Design a protein around this nucleic acid. Structure first.
Lengths: 96, 114, 79, 151, 206, 98, 127
RNA sequence: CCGGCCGGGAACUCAAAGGAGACUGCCAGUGAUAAACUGGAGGAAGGUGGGGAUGACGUCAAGUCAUCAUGGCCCUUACGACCAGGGCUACACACGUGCUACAAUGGCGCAUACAAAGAGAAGCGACCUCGCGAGAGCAAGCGGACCUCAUAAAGUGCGUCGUAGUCCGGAUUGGAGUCUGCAACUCGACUCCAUGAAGUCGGAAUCGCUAGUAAUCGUGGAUCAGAAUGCCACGGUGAAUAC
């Protein structure tokens, strides 16, 4: 789904684990009941795609944004296709 | 029974007849009767006069009828004279708090025209 | 509303407001940053706020202060 | 009912009087699957019915329900391309089923305080057959009496 | 569009899974996508080799890919340089130390992947479809094969409307769940577009 | 003492594997409790089956994770030497935590 | 001595133990009128004991879990009738005839896709 | 230490694997002595036991070129790409599907009982302290029949309200906040105080349901940083009626 969008997604992940989880430290530790200075609330001139709330969780194969399933990492369409062929282990039809 | 204004409520439990005062609901009324040391389920009949003006003395400590109506009106006028979104929105007569006007804005907008 | 800790403005708008009050209110400011809570030092400036297509000038009065910028720049034109 | 002739399921009798008749009466009264509430209403209402009439419990109920049971009822045919309201003889299970439905419905129509008073006053108004459910029975019997010409 | 995939409804009954690793939720998606990459690669790079199945299993941080193919010699080659090349690149893809095996699919005209790939190859060599289908049904029924149905579809012979034209011989009991129905599907990218080839092969009743 | 907790998607495969670990352990060492079964986790997935509109057509699927617990009591050196490097299972996760 | 019945009913399970003795009923270390005897139809745990009577016949220690009120009660009824192997297969003529040894195998029907609940189909517009 | 709490017991619930079981098998009657039907016994279940999965050849040149793949056509300093702000949330209106109501079979306050199914590591997050509350602080335990989400609610027992637009109903609006997130103005969710519309059972018409069903009551999950009255599941109470 539009190569550009998948490339954009990889950009957001790479910035997400470069800056944040290392300087997202700020928003967890210094924005707190400690002193204060306005400074670390203004030290969010980090490139806005380091934010991990900007990944979409696209389908791993087709990049489809909607219908994602976090367990399999795929959209519902590729979950069904692969589920029926037998590449998803353990998964089968359900009836109860 | 003429408490907090021209408000005269009576023949009803004191937690609920106090709710007739514009600016006290159930919580604030429990606060008035607890602060004045009055049981919650006595009427205004069967309640003494010194007891009544202890309720007057307690209801005087919150912003009620006139002061509250002009405080609310003052807030809305400040918004409509700013010309913010909440003021233009408040001014046209359309829902303020980001609700749906495509359909079902009907309290705020009034019964349907043609 | 929001935020027990700090209000919000962008750092570029912080610097443009500091330089705007230091060297006097000369010109309206191009601001895209509608995210931004009006500060009391911003009183008297003319800050044009982007409404999707146009920067509309907002003259800051004293009672603008507990508000975002974009409240004074409507985005949809209804007739 | 197109093909399937059916059986019927057996209801547990009343836990105070052992009456399956009155058990079906608390099922007719029950709303929203709340059976405890309905049997409380029936015990209160029939208890004040037994206290008021002084007879007993379920013979005061059986008299008050005996005055509202329909004899025959109208029923549509649509056989000869016409709308007929033929009179037809009611089966006994349907007879007291209609009796209870009319008592309960008329008791929901009344304007007293509690449901036990609405239904106690409705059964008391049906004991000397002057209530609303007896007007429903006389109405049904005027329809089947006017249209007697179809059998 | 209305029939269930006849492999998927038999997954616990008679047919096995082509992936037989266990994994928790942390690495289920990663193992699964790594399987898409090794089947994608290993399907593209053995297009001439007539490959039927590729079965992945992961015994304790190592992949074990089994290539069910009809021509094992062309997969292995003159002393198996091609196999060690393939496990080198599968070890590159999956990131684990790779093993690789080759299972010889004898009777290749009873395997639906090989039949659909056959008919697809013939359709993209511009032969008429009735020969491809009809030959496939005849030579598949010739060796065992208690039933077979093939079904091509879509703009067949270069038309401007799309037909299907399926054939079948013998018994293909598709609602019976203990039936060993070997079903598979290919696509023929011709100069008129895609032609879909499905083939069901009924082998036995349990 | 030594709990070995096995998980797999196939119940024939897990009770084969745990039968092998039981007879291995109590053959070499001693005091194996037994394959206690510990409820199957059924994770259900309900996907839309069509590539466009049509909500009401859905396909329901499940993954059943089976556990077994063994809980070998005696810490013989022979049973921990003989218990390692001997699984021959492919779709089983073992946990050999003491 | 000690006589057992398994006795389940819509997601309940009532262990029913019977010793011969008085007419007391002990359910989850609690009396009958205190467990659910403040509520609807405590008669149904007493229905198997009116087919030949319990007046001072047998003390029963019962322990039910799962289910609701009526589910637990029906589970105890089935549990006592399964636990009247105290007397022989005599009782299970008449106890069969009241419909008490039947495990009432009505369970809640599952919700099905495209239906709001088990059979209530969502309402359909114009035609 | 009265709590399965401990030693212990493996009976029981239960867990999960393997079996038995239900086939008109037996009996009576009716029937071409046939198929079968009706009734009866035994049995947990009786006649495809209940439910699901399973959807024939084809129909609608039905839906999807926007999941993907793809023939042809078309743009290729642009119909491609990057960015910020906006919009998809607009509102004289009309329709669909739902939720909450109009109450006393109820509202509110106090006490108290009984579930099933699930999810959880960049996660679920006890206990304890602070806050009226949403929540905050320190922080165990748990990759999990062990810990957490997590108190089921209708129910029941007391008291009150008393047929009032009312102690119904909660929309709307003002103020004060909490959390998530670079960021809640357009345009979140939740909390507290205040406000307290419309609505008193719905015109023509129309819909769903045959038994653990409808009705009604809660709980969970997927997507998800945060956002469900929707969707998918789970149990509690539990009908009426079918000539």
């Amino acid at each position: 789904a539009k190569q550009s969008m998948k490339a954009r997604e990889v950009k957001r992940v790479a910035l997400a684990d470069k800056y944040f989880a290392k300087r997202a430290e700020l928003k967890a530790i210094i924005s707190d009941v400690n002193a204060r200075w306005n400074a670390v609330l203004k030290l969010q001139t980090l490139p806005r795609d380091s934010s991990p709330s900007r990944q979409r969780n696209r389908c791993r194969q087709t990049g489809r944004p909607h219908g994602f399933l976090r367990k399999f990492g795929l959209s519902r369409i590729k979950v069904r296709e692969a589920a029926m062929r037998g590449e998803i282990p353990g998964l089968k039809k359900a009836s109860w | 029974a003429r408490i907090a204004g021209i408000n005269i409520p009576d023949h009803k439990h004191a937690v609920i007849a106090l709710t007739s005062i514009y600016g006290v609901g159930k919580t604030r009324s429990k606060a008035i009767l607890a602060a004045a040391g009055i049981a919650e389920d006595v009427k205004i009949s069967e309640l003494s006069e010194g007891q009544i003006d202890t309720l007057r003395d307690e209801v005087a400590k919150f912003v009620v009828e006139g002061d509250l109506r002009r405080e609310i009106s003052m807030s809305i006028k400040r918004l409509m004279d700013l010309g913010c979104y909440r003021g233009l929105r408040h001014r046209r007569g359309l829902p303020v708090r980001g609700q749906r006007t495509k359909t079902n804005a009907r309290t705020r907008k009034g019964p349907r025209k043609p | 509303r929001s935020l027990k800790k700090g209000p919000f403005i962008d750092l570029h708008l912080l610097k443009k407001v500091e330089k705007a009050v230091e060297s006097g209110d000369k010109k309206p400011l191009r601001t895209w940053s509608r995210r931004s809570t009006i500060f009391p030092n911003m009183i008297g400036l003319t800050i044009a706020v982007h409404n999707g297509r146009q920067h509309v000038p907002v003259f800051v009065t004293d009672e603008m202060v507990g508000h975002k910028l974009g409240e004074f720049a409507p985005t949809r034109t209804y007739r | 009912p197109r093909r399937r002739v059916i059986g019927q399921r057996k209801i547990l009798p009343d836990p105070k009087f052992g009456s399956e008749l009155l058990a079906k009466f608390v099922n007719i009264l029950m709303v929203d699957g709340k059976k405890s509430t309905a049997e409380s209403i029936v015990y209160s209402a029939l208890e004040t019915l037994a206290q008021r009439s002084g007879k007993s419990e379920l013979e005061a109920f059986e008299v008050a329900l005996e005055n509202v049971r329909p004899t025959v009822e109208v029923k549509s045919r649509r056989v000869g391309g016409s709308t007929y309201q033929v009179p037809v003889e009611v089966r006994p299970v349907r007879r007291n089923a209609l009796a209870m439905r009319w008592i309960v419905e008329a008791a929901r129509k009344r304007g007293d305080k509690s449901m036990a008073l609405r239904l106690a006053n409705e059964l008391s108004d049906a004991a000397e057959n002057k209530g609303t459910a007896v007007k429903k029975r006389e109405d049904v019997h005027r329809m089947a009496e006017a249209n007697k010409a179809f059998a | 569009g209305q029939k269930v995939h006849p492999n998927g409804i038999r997954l616990g009954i008679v047919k096995p899974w082509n992936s037989t690793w266990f994994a928790n939720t942390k690495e289920f998606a990663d193992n699964l996508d790594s399987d898409f990459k090794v089947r994608q690669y290993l399907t593209k790079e053995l297009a001439k080799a007539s490959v039927s199945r590729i079965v992945i299993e992961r015994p304790a941080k190592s992949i074990r890919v089994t290539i069910h193919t009809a021509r094992p010699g062309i997969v292995i080659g003159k002393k198996g340089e091609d196999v060690e090349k393939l496990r080198k690149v599968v070890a590159d893809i999956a990131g684990v130390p790779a093993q690789i095996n080759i299972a010889e699919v004898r009777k290749p005209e009873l395997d639906a992947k090989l039949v659909a790939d056959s008919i697809t190859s013939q359709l993209e060599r511009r032969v008429m479809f009735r020969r491809a289908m009809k030959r496939a049904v005849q030579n598949a029924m010739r060796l065992g094969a208690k039933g077979i149905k093939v079904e091509v579809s879509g703009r067949l012979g270069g038309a401007e409307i799309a037909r299907t034209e399926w054939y079948r011989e013998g018994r293909v009991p598709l609602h019976t769940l203990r039936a060993d129905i070997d079903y598979n599907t290919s696509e023929a990218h011709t100069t008129y577009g895609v032609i879909g080839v499905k083939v069901w092969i009924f082998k036995g009743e349990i | 003492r030594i709990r070995i907790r096995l998980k797999a998607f196939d119940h024939r495969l897990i009770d084969q594997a745990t039968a092998e670990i039981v007879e291995t352990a109590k053959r070499t060492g001693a005091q194996v409790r037994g394959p206690i079964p510990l409820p199957t986790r059924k994770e259900r997935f309900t996907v839309l089956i069509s590539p466009h509109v049509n909500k009401d057509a859905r396909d329901q699927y499940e993954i059943r994770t089976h556990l077994r617990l063994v809980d070998i009591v005696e810490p013989t050196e022979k049973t921990v030497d003989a218990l390692m490097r001997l699984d021959l299972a492919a779709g089983v996760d073992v946990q050999i935590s003491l | 001595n000690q006589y057992y019945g398994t006795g389940r009913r819509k997601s309940s399970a009532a262990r029913v133990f019977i010793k011969p003795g008085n007419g007391k009923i002990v359910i989850n270390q609690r009396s009958l009128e205190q467990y659910f005897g403040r509520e609807t139809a405590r008669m149904v745990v007493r229905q198997p004991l009116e087919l030949v009577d319990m007046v001072e016949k047998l003390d029963l220690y019962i322990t039910v879990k799962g289910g609701g009120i009526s589910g637990q009660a029906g589970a105890i009824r089935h549990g006592i009738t399964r636990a009247l192997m105290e007397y022989d297969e005599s009782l299970r003529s008449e106890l069969r005839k009241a419909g008490f040894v039947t495990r009432d195998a009505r369970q809640v029907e599952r919700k099905k896709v495209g239906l709001r609940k088990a059979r209530r189909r969502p309402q359909f517009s114009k035609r």
